[PDB]
């Protein structure tokens, strides 16, 4: 259930050790640690990130993301 599909506008490390990313004008946060280096890489390289969640309109964080490289 694709929440947002796009390039990472910005990322933010939070005081509670979570990680926010603004994708397609909407902010998403995750408690997953392994996602932190994967997401900024994706941000830096200009990757196409697809944030997936069942409850997409609750303010609940994601933990499922697909990474695709950019085309030209």
């Amino acid at each position: 259930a694709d929440c947002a599909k796009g390039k990472i506008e910005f990322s933010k490390y939070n005081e509670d050790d979570t990680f926010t990313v603004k994708v397609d004008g909407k902010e998403y946060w995750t408690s997953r640690w392994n996602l932190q280096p994967l997401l900024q890489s994706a941000q830096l390289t200009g990757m196409t990130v697809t944030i997936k969640s069942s409850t997409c309109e609750s303010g609940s964080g994601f933990a499922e993301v697909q990474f695709n490289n950019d085309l030209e």
Partner: nanobody, 117 residues
Framework: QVQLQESGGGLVQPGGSLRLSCAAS????????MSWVRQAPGKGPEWVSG????????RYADSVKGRFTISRDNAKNTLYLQMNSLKPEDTALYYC??????????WGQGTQVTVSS
């Protein structure tokens, strides 16, 4: 079997307080971010509060920030929600959710909260 058992709900008068408790079993509780989500009648699900493994790092939805306070007891595998100064807009069925609360399969059967006069 993974089980989450919410308790502490009921009928409270507006301005009153309540303390929700969720007793987790069947999985290693200390390994998971825990959160509370409410489902108001007619409305969709609303994420309310979250807490990191560790119990130090909390998150709150803007609607409850200042009135609610999430805590965890990793020694007792329990998650708590202190609901103070309750508005009627909080009459909802409160689920204790494993993770960020993005998946309803990983919720327990909710505890009913009704703030009325």
């Amino acid at each position: 079997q993974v089980q989450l058992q919410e308790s502490g709900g009921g009928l409270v008068q507006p301005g009153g307080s309540l303390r929700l408790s969720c007793a987790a079993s069947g999985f290693t509780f200390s390994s998971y971010y825990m959160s509370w989500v409410r489902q108001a009648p007619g409305k969709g699900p609303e994420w309310v509060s979250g807490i990191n493994t560790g119990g130090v790092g909390t998150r709150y939805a803007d609607s409850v920030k200042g009135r609610f306070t999430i805590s965890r007891d990793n020694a007792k595998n329990t998650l708590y929600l202190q609901m103070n100064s309750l508005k009627p807009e909080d009459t909802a069925l409160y689920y204790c959710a494993i993770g960020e609360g993005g998946n309803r399969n990983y919720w327990g059967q909710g505890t009913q909260v009704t703030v009325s006069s």
